Amino acid sequence: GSHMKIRQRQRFGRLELKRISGRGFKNDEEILIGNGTIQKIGIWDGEEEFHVRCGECRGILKKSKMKLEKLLINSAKKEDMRDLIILCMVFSQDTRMFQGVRGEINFLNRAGQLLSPMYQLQRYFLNRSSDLFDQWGYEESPKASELHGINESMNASDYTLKGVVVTKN
Numbered sequence: 735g736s737h738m739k740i741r742q743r744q745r746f747g748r749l750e751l752k753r754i755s756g757r758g759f760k761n762d763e764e765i766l767i768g769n770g771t772i773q774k775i776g777i778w779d780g781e782e783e784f785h786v787r788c789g790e791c792r793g794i795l796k797k798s799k800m801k802l803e804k805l806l807i808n809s810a811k812k813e814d815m816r817d818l819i820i821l822c823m824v825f826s827q828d829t830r831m832f833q834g835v836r837g838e839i840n841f842l843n844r845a846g847q848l849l850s851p852m853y854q855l856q857r858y859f860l861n862r863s864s865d866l867f868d869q870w871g872y873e874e875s876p877k878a879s880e881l882h883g884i885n886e887s888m889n890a891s892d893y894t895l896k897g898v899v900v901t902k903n
């Protein structure tokens with residue numbers, strides 16, 4: 735439907751979600767993507783908390799408008815952690831995710847049909863993940879030792895992708 739309901743499993747392609755709290759309101763906005771093209775996109779506004787999964791990787795997501803606030807992941811198979819992080823970055827509509835679009839991206843297919851902007855961004859980044867990580871930035875990992883940082887190669891690290899933390903497991 736239109737909005738993800740508390741406790742309801744939902745899909746955004748490869749990302750699975752399930753609301754813990756909050757409400758979003760969606761408004762259309764002209765967004766500048768890093769391409770230099772300006773595209774009309776449905777921007778959610780409000781604080782939202784979700785359970786998320788990509789394959790075997792689980793976590794909890796907090797967002798606000800156009801910002802991934804916090805993402806706590808449970809340790810898992812590396813490919814899945816990497817995609818869960820990408821899918822969370824796109825799902826949150828973070829200003830930095832928009833900036834990382836470098837190459838051409840289509841919002842219309844060759845038959846001239848209408849494609850989903852958020853879906854097409856997910857497709858662009860699952861395939862060119864670098865292009866998001868370039869924009870993302872690092873911060874000091876959490877002081878506690880039940881919590882670790884992770885870098886874009888998915889190894890534990892003393893500096894971590896901003897807002898991202900890992901628990902074992």
Ligand SMILES: Nc1nc2c(ncn2[C@@H]2O[C@H](COP(=O)(O)OP(=O)(O)O)[C@@H](O)[C@H]2O)c(=O)[nH]1
Pocket residue numbers: 735736737738739745746758775776778782825850851852853
């Ligand atoms: N933050 C947030 N995003 C949602 C919610 N419900 C759906 N979405 C996402 O909002 C986007 C909807 O975009 P799309 O399906 O292309 O529909 P459009 O916005 O009507 O053009 C998708 O990426 C969904 O995963 C919600 O409750 N909160």
